[PDB]
Amino acid sequence: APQQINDIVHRTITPLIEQQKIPGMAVAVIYQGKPYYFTWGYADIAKKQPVTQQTLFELGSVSKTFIGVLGGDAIARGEIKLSDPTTKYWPELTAKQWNGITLLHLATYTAGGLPLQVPDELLRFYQNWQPAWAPGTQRLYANSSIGLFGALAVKPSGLSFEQAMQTRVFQPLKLNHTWINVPGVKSTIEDMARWVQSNLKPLDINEKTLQQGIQLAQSRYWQTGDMYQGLGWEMLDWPVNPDSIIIALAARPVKAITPPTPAVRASWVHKTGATGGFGSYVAFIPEKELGIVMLANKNYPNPARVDAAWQILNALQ
């Protein structure tokens, strides 16, 4: 690796691993469209199996980006529109509320207060669930929302969510060691590097609908403060300071972006695994052809991920 990448990575990540007591981590820095790999500590922490470029990590909430891109791909295939009501794809949902709730609302956590997790205690739950606010006014980060989006998004495909993901996203992007097991995602630093490159430069992707799908996942649908909501991905205008980038449930009023702004290449585009309890983090700046994946098992505080990522990307940019 270039000395600059070498320097910034070790100068940044080692202090992170020791301050947070992280047992194992893999990092990929993509610089000018090329990945450079780094590993520390253990996958099997107890039995001391070292992290390698092929170590599988559970992505946790970073999984949502794959759902966002599969959704985008389905839009590009003419299969769904985000303005379609939820009841077009799940008619069993015969409630006062669900009319007026669109796929857009599900994909972007703006349905009106669907919960972060499906309660420990589905068709029963969803029918009974009533919205705290009108659809499309407040963003509340929710698995029960984007998880429902994904199940409905693949109804026109003639494939299970698992098959659609594998054949429309994993295979075309040659993500050979990436798995979903659906009755989310585990992957390797090599595959995640490739995932970052694909989202950094959709124009090198030859599958036409996927290229458009990746691009649609970075459209700006809602704005709250300095952040813009994509499909899975979240974005901020670049340059930004780490402080502006960054402790449970936050339901936030959003401004509708009508029509959604096409992917702005001058963006800090990112997703954290942190709100699910997973140590993964991805960020990239399309216009700089620059990105980073940080995979870990230990769920360390999210502000530390951003600081480290920003350190590295700011140095290289």
UniProtKB/Swiss-Prot annotation:
An example Gene Ontology biological process: antibiotic catabolic process
Uppermost EC category: hydrolase
Effect of residue 249 to A: Reduces binding affinity of inhibitor compound 3 about 30-fold
Main location: periplasm
Matching SUPFAM superfamilies: beta-lactamase/transpeptidase-like
Reaction(s) this enzyme catalyzes, per UniProt: a beta-lactam + H2O = a substituted beta-amino acid
Enzyme Commission numbers on file: 3.5.2.6
InterPro entries attached to this UniProt entry: Bact_CellWall_Synth/Modif, Beta-lactam-related, Beta-lactam/transpept-like, Beta-lactam_class-C_AS
Miscellaneous field: The class C beta-lactamase family has a specific amino-acid numbering system known as SANC, for structural alignment-based numbering of class C beta-lactamases, or else the simpler name structural position. A multiple sequence alignment was used to derive a consensus sequence and then the consensus was numbered taking into account insertions and deletions. This allows use of identical numbers, e.g. for active site residues, despite differences in protein length.
Family annotation (NCBIfam families): bla_class_C, BlaEC, CMY2-MIR-ACT-EC
Family note: Belongs to the class-C beta-lactamase family.
Quaternary assembly: Monomer.
Protein name: Beta-lactamase
Species of origin: Escherichia coli (strain K12)
Record lineage: Bacteria, Pseudomonadati, Pseudomonadota, Gammaproteobacteria, Enterobacterales
